[PDB]
Amino acid sequence: LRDETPLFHKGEIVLCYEPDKSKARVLYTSKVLNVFERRNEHGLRFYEYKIHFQGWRPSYDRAVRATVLLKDTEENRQLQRELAEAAKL
């Protein structure tokens, strides 16, 4: 395997996928609290993104991988709205 690149920064607003795989997919508006560089068993770098879920108390804060995060673009905001509606269908 091979080094990740850090893709998000402290203070950034990002959209985070629901981790529960039993649930219809939805995105949560989140804030990056910390970006921590680690190396895996192969000696390659990966990043742990500690995030806060906007509108929730800090006890809900979690560290996640880049794969579950999206940039806060208009297109991803629309995706979030689409998914939220579908979850309610």
Resolution, rounded to a tenth of an Å? 1.3
Give the Cα separation of 67 and 58 in Å (integer). Answer: 22
- In the PDB record, what is the listed experimental method? X-ray
Q: How does strand 13-17 pair with strand 69-71?
A: antiparallel
CATH tag for 1-72 (out of 3.40.50.300, 3.30.360.10, 2.40.50.100, 2.30.30.140):
2.30.30.140
Q: Identify how many contiguous H helices and E strands the chain contains and give both numbers.
A: 1, 5
The CA distance from 16 to 44, in Å, is 24
Adjacent-strand bridge partners of 50: 34, 63
CATH class of the structural domain 73-89: mainly alpha
Domain limits, the chain: 1-72, 73-89
Cα–Cα distance for residue pair 62/24, rounded to 1 Å:
20
